[PDB]
Swiss-Prot record, chains A, B:
TetR is the repressor of the tetracycline resistance element; its N-terminal region forms a helix-turn-helix structure and binds DNA. Binding of tetracycline to TetR reduces the repressor affinity for the tetracycline resistance gene (tetA) promoter operator sites. Mg(2+) binds at H99. The keyword Metal-binding applies. This is Tetracycline repressor protein class D. SUPFAM superfamilies: Homeodomain-like, Tetracyclin repressor-like, C-terminal domain. One of its GO terms (molecular function) is transcription cis-regulatory region binding. Keywords: Antibiotic resistance, DNA-binding, Magnesium, Metal-binding, Plasmid, Repressor, Transcription, Transcription regulation. The lineage of its organism: Bacteria, Pseudomonadati, Pseudomonadota, Gammaproteobacteria, Enterobacterales. One of its GO terms (biological process) is response to antibiotic. It comes from Escherichia coli. Homodimer. Tetracycline binds at H63, N81.
Amino acid sequence: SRLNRESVIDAALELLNETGIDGLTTRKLAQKLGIEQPTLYWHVKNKRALLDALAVEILARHHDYSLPAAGESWQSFLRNNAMSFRRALLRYRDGAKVHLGARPDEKQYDTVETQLRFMTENGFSLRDGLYAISAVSHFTLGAVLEQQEHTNLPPLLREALQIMDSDDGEQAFLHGLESLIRGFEVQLTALLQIV
Amino acid sequence: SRLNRESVIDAALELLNETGIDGLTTRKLAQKLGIEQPTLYWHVKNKRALLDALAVEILARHHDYSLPAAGESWQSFLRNNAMSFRRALLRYRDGAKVHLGARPDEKQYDTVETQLRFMTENGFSLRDGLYAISAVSHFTLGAVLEQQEHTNLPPLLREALQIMDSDDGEQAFLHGLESLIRGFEVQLTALLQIV
Ligand SMILES: CN(C)[C@@H]1C(O)=C(C(N)=O)C(=O)[C@@]2(O)C(O)=C3C(=O)c4c(O)cccc4[C@@](C)(O)[C@H]3C[C@@H]12
Ligand SMILES: CN(C)[C@@H]1C(O)=C(C(N)=O)C(=O)[C@@]2(O)C(O)=C3C(=O)c4c(O)cccc4[C@@](C)(O)[C@H]3C[C@@H]12
Ligand SMILES: [Cl-]
Ligand SMILES: [Cl-]
Ligand SMILES: [Cl-]
Ligand SMILES: [Cl-]
Ligand SMILES: [Cl-]
Ligand SMILES: [Cl-]
Ligand SMILES: [Cl-]
Ligand SMILES: [Cl-]
Ligand SMILES: [Mg+2]
Ligand SMILES: [Mg+2]
């Protein structure tokens, strides 16, 4: 079949949904594509390189809210961005694991950059903007990982574990997300006051 | 050598630090212990079972702040608990990954339970206590995973990536942790007011 980048990634994503991250191999990708392994090697040098590309592509394809709208607030931006990031990570099997093992690609540099400039333009120091953005990313990645890796009791925990498996985790995610955002705002507004 | 539970786990933890999670195998554990594989199988049935036990043991050994002190506030408890949980997850290679893939063990049921009762005894509904505790756990797991898996630029990002690799991640972690805790308190205090 065709072995241009876009096609190889299409097939590897399809493969990822079939096998998950641990079970994805270049050998099975060759098989899926109808080719021999040394043919694949010309195109894709190893699993690490494949996963690096999948991490970038998964965001490029599906992470629709990386940039703020004209005039949007920083609260609203972080909210929408977190929800988009969560959604994209959920779309493929082990997507958060794929995301974690990879590097902040040159092809996205300018996206991140803009997000950091945006925070700063709304009153955060670089440091605080970064921390805000990192806390959101880590909270979101954590919540998704636990959702995806989720694949006799005491009473509270019995009702916790029922409550906990009542939807996708969307409720607990969204509730935490507001908590975090309000905590950032309380910090931003305080300036040099003891808070 | 000796193949009682405690010894097998000692050796598997030592092995985990040598190989990481992907590279830990029952075969290499047998090797480390000076035994044949079928001897190991009597004791440990597969990797999944090994990892399940390591996840529990890593907390039991090293997670010193699972229960609140007499009279401690819920803010203080969550803070200390998060820091303890982070510390324990960091102690072994891929510790957060080991933690994620495992299940909330019967041997800890009563620890979690108590934490959930404690939140509730301080004014949270079960739901909110749970969410608070889950957001902390997910934020912490996310931050640790990214620390552990962390193993030409634009300016801000250049200074972000320098700032970001200035310590262990302890600063960004602790700053987010306070944000989250304050966000929980703002929610708890508001009751039925629009907030
Ligand atoms: C908050 N939200 C989840 C952000 C986002 O939506 C991204 C995007 N491409 O649209 C990320 O890459 C984003 O999701 C993301 O993963 C970001 C990063 O990983 C990093 C790392 O590791 C180091 C320095 C800077 C960044 C970053 C500023 O680009 C991060 C931006 C993250
Ligand atoms: C907040 N802090 C990190 C808590 C903790 O310190 C624990 C401990 N053993 O001391 C956990 O097990 C704790 O770290 C932890 O992982 C908890 C859990 O995973 C769960 C899951 O998955 C489902 C229901 C309930 C729990 C829980 C209440 O036991 C969680 C308690 C977590
Ligand atoms: Cl071709
Ligand atoms: Cl292409
Ligand atoms: Cl491979
Ligand atoms: Cl807005
Ligand atoms: Cl023995
Ligand atoms: Cl023993
Ligand atoms: Cl194995
Ligand atoms: Cl206190
Ligand atoms: Mg990232
Ligand atoms: Mg857990």
